[PDB]
């Protein structure tokens, strides 16, 4: 996976072929990408928004804004680095507010109780 | 502007084939820049091609 502002793409390395265009529209500058073994792709925005996508479809299933530590400037609400733990169940992020944040998936969730963002590919953007 | 200036320099001295080779390179390099396609189109239309 590779990303530039508002643009996350997936590439097959065996031949350098474009695999999928993610639904990264309006997410702004992306500072970091991480992929776990469950096909979750995480994109950390410079605007401080955590974007979670399904790697195979490129579907953005969750958007979650980080909260900067007390006394921080609005510009400090920015994700700078990330990595999943070895099991892929914990996401570690380093931010401009000088803190490290640990994220984990909700175990009470299910396909029906937490559907996430709807699959609704925007035809207006010609990235298909 | 550099591409356009180069193409114009080529056309002003009537080197139409150098200009063609250059316009083909321009659209092959930056196919999403409409200005380059319109330049090639207007050049060939001026020559009744």
């Amino acid at each position: 996976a590779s990303a530039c502002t508002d643009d996350i793409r997936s590439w097959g390395l065996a031949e350098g072929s474009l695999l999928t265009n993610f639904e990264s529209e309006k997410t702004g500058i992306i500072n970091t990408l991480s992929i776990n073994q469950d096909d979750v792709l995480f994109a950390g925005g410079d605007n401080g928004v955590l974007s979670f996508y399904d790697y195979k479809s490129g579907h953005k299933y969750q958007s979650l804004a980080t909260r900067e530590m007390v006394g921080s400037l609005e510009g400090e609400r920015s994700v700078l680095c990330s990595t999943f733990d070895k099991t892929g169940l914990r996401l570690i992020t380093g931010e401009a507010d000088k803190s490290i944040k640990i994220w984990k998936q909700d175990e009470t969730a299910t396909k029906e109780s937490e559907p996430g963002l709807a699959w609704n590919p925007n035809l207006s953007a010609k990235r298909f | 502007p550099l591409w356009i200036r180069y193409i114009d320099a080529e056309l002003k001295v009537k080197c139409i084939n150098h200009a063609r080779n250059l316009m083909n390179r321009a659209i092959s390099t930056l196919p999403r820049v409409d200005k380059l396609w319109y330049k090639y189109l207007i050049v060939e239309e001026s020559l009744n091609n």
């Binding site: 065996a14 999928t20 195979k56 479809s57 298909f128 | 083909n24 092959s28 196919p31």
Partner: peptide, 25 residues
């Protein structure tokens, strides 16, 4: 003829996995 912008092909822009998410890599 096919001499114009020979190196530019529509398929280079199309994401191969959109037609089949489960494509094997």
């Amino acid at each position: 003829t096919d001499q114009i912008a020979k190196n530019v092909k529509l398929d280079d822009f199309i994401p191969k996995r959109q037609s089949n998410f489960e494509l094997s890599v």
